[PDB]
Amino acid sequence: QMRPELTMPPAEAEALRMAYEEAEVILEYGSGGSTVVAAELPGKHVTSVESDRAWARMMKAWLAANPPAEGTEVNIVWTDIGPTGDWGHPVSDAKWRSYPDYPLAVWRTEGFRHPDVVLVDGRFRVGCALATAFSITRPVTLLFDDYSQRRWQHQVEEFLGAPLMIGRLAAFQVEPQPIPPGSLMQLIRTMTSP
Amino acid sequence: QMRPELTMPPAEAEALRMAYEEAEVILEYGSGGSTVVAAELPGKHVTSVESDRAWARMMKAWLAANPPAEGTEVNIVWTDIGPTGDWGHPVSDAKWRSYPDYPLAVWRTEGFRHPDVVLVDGRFRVGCALATAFSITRPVTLLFDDYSQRRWQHQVEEFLGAPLMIGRLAAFQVEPQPIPPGSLMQLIRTMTSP
């Protein structure tokens, strides 16, 4: 039947489901099983940023074959960061000048709808988290897949606050805020590290 | 008489001298003739960001042979953007992940002194101009050399305002600017374009 699977364990999946149920507008970085969870709920607006062109094509084919629930719209947005390999990572740094497109372009989309919940489950994860923090105009829930207190990952807490962990899934209550100019170098690093 | 030369025409060079006379703290991007102009004035604090290691070494040697005027300190700061060719331009993009350091690192330097005047006369010119606008906490004069040179440059005015043109040299009165989040993709491209 070729259905995209949710690759998170049960407690984490339930947390995601619950977030998606409370949300009207959902923004994801990285498409798959979670996208299906959203598609199946009525009355949602879903945007899913995806770097793997062939996977995006598959997701679009699946959604054509299995249309979303009533009043739900799902937009899979292939976002070009160059050729990608077996597991969705860029083959090389060929398209480094386009890297910031992945965390940031969606925030300037035509007919932008403010998310209620943002799932960070793709590439440039810390970058996507900081892009959300700096781009929102009202508070959101951010879910960060496979979050740990690894130093790279943890740098988000300055901007995202402390998370509540459900297994390895981090939930943050993210509030709008300015970009600190002293943080620009750090910021750039995050939006160019796949 | 093996002296670094100021390659600005007269009008432009006089504007530079006057700005430097009026400033206490001078920040330059690009080192050379302008730096000698600053060095020869008393009571200045001068920092010059430089991408060409071999040229930085020459400037240091020059300054050791020809010490600055009384009360003046000159710090030539080689900022590694990889191997360079003409005009301190990187010969490849090996060090692309370090490019933002050129416009931005000096603003975080230990021993930081807020500039009164900034000269944009090296690499990443647009990036350096924006870095200043977004990093300053009180107004400065920014002098942007060879400003007519490109049209990619005039995206500067959005944040620096309208310049006073002295020949090819643009003099800006810069006031501190917040970073618009929607500008981040554009901003990143300016701090990674040599």
Note whether A134 contacts B184, CB cutoff 8 Å: yes
Note whether A191 contacts B192, CB cutoff 8 Å: no
Is the Cβ of B178 closer than 8 Å to some Cβ of chain A? Answer: yes
Type of residue numbered A90: P
- Which among A167, A163, A111, A110 is positioned nearest to A133, based on CA atoms? A163
- Which among B136, B143, B138 is positioned nearest to B29, based on CA atoms? B143
Indicate the burial class of A31 (C-beta count within 10 angstroms; 0-12, 13-18, 19 or more).
Answer: buried
Type of residue numbered B88: G
Where residue B176 falls (left for φ over 0; alpha for ψ -120 to 50; beta otherwise) is beta
Residue that the structure tokens 């990889």 belong to: B82
**Distance from the A193 Cα atom to the nearest Cα atom in chain B, whole angstroms:** 9
Is the Cβ of B91 closer than 8 Å to some Cβ of chain A? Answer: no
* First-to-last C-alpha distance (Å) of chain A: 31
Q: What is the DSSP letter of A147?
A: -
- Measure CB to CB from residue B178 to each of A104, A131, A178 and give the nearest one: A178
Is the Cβ of A104 closer than 8 Å to some Cβ of chain B? Answer: yes
> Which residues of chain A lie closer than 8 angstroms to B82, CB-CB?
none
> Which residues of chain B lie closer than 8 angstroms to A104, CB-CB?
184-185
Establish, for the pair of chains A and B, how many residue pairs have beta carbons separated by less than 8 Å.
58
**Distance from the B142 Cα atom to the nearest Cα atom in chain A, whole angstroms:** 18
Supply φ then ψ for residue B111, to 5 degrees: 85, 15
How was it solved? X-ray
Count of Cβ atoms closer than 10 Å to residue B186 Cβ: 15
- Resolution to 1 decimal place, in Å: 1.8
**Distance from the A15 Cα atom to the nearest Cα atom in chain B, whole angstroms:** 30
Q: What is the CA radius of gyration of chain A?
A: 16
Among the four given CATH numbers 3.40.50.150, 3.40.50.1980, 3.40.50.2300, 2.60.120.620, the one describing domain A1-194: 3.40.50.150
Rounded Cα distance between B93 and B194, Å, is: 10
Note whether B108 contacts A185, CB cutoff 8 Å: yes
**Distance from the B23 Cα atom to the nearest Cα atom in chain A, whole angstroms:** 24
B167 and B110 Cβ atoms separated by less than 8 Å: no
- Which among A25, A6, A8 is positioned nearest to A117, based on CA atoms? A25
